[PDB]
């Protein structure tokens, strides 16, 4: 825990159980009936639950646990992760953080991932002994305080434009760089924290693409055998 590592936060993520406001919406009730599950225990998924989101605040961007899934598959299966050069976290839109042990094997199947998220939200930590995933009430600033990095970067389409290769070289100049990528499909961050905004392209990209550019660019600097 003294070697250089990237601390990557997928932040303001659209990962939540079904909003209390819409628990009785027919599309929710029908879905939960079919799944034989209590609605309040179910992970919100706009693919199934869109009809119920029409009237919800930010309804159009909520319920995107797919973004976290694909980001985490990309991050945890990375060479950077295997070389013990990555720590990854999820901060959700409702100010919960998920801590992930680096050795975690995330379900490749999305539906199995959702099942895992349902278990995590219910029990607070999974599995019982290992606690490969652990969740608690926490703001993005509180998380950053815990990491105590020497620099915070916020990946932002409007930030300082950098060639991805060059951003990797920049990250390798720090001991404990934190990079924040939004876990939401469009719009602004909800959590304004101090950090350096960095663009890698002058068009919007998906979170997983940004994850890949950052991780791969860093890999080729920080792993001396590369």
Residues forming contacts to a second copy in the complex (CB under 8 A) are 45-47, 64, 66-67, 70, 73-74, 77-79, 82, 108-112, 163-165, 185, 200-201, 203, 205-206, 208-209, 212-213, 215-217, 219-220, 226
Report if residue 165 touches ligand SO3, rule: CB under 6 A.
no
Least CB distance from residue 98 to ligand ADN, whole Å? 17
CB 24 within 8 A of CB 195: no
Contacts of 125 (CB under 8 A, 6+ apart): 131, 133, 134, 135
* 200 is an annotated ligand-binding site residue: yes
H helices of the chain, where? 26-35, 46-53, 65-76, 79-82, 110-123, 140-147, 164-171, 207-222
Question: Is 205 annotated in some ligand binding site?
Answer: yes
In degrees and rounded to multiples of 5, residue 100 shows phi and psi of -130, 115
Are 92 and 98 in contact by the 8 Å Cβ rule? The answer is yes
Q: Is 99 annotated to bind ligand?
A: no
Per CB under 6 A, does 108 bind ligand ADN? no
Answer yes or no: are the C-beta atoms of 8 and 213 closer than 8 Å. Answer: no
Q: Which is nearer to a second copy, 78 or 92 (CB)?
A: 78
Q: Is 74 in the site for ligand ADN (CB under 6 A)?
A: no
Which among 144, 136, 132 is positioned nearest to 194, based on CA atoms? Answer: 144
Is 201 annotated as contributing to ligand binding? yes
Residues contributing to the site for ligand ADN (CB under 6 A): 155-157, 181-182, 199-201, 204-207, 210
Residues contributing to the site for ligand SO3 (CB under 6 A): 37-38, 41, 47, 107-109, 112
Annotated binding site for S-adenosyl-L-methionine: 182, 187, 200-205
């Amino acid at each position: 825990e003294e070697k250089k590592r990237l601390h990557l936060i997928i932040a303001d993520a659209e990962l939540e159980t079904v909003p209390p406001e819409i628990l009785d919406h027919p599309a929710i009730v029908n879905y939960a009936k079919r799944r034989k599950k209590r609605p309040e225990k179910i992970i919100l998924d706009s693919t199934y639950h869109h009809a119920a989101l029409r009237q919800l605040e930010d309804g159009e961007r909520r319920g995107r646990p797919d973004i976290v899934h694909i980001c985490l598959l990309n991050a945890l299966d990375s060479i950077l992760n295997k070389e013990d050069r990555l720590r990854v976290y999820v901060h959700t839109r409702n100010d919960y953080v998920i801590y992930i042990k680096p050795e975690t094997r995330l379900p490749r199947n999305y539906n199995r991932f959702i099942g895992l998220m349902e278990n995590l939200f219910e029990k607070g930590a999974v599995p019982e002994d290992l606690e490969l995933l652990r969740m608690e009430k926490k703001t993005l600033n509180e998380l950053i305080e815990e990491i105590n990095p020497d620099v915070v970067f916020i990946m932002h389409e409007e930030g300082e434009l950098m060639i991805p290769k060059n951003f990797g070289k920049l990250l390798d100049k720090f001991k404990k760089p934190t990079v924040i990528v939004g876990g939401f499909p469009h719009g602004d961050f909800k959590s304004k924290v101090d950090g350096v905004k960095i663009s890698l392209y002058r068009e919007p990209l998906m979170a997983w693409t940004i994850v890949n550019e950052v991780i791969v660019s860093y890999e080729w600097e920080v792993i001396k055998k590369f």
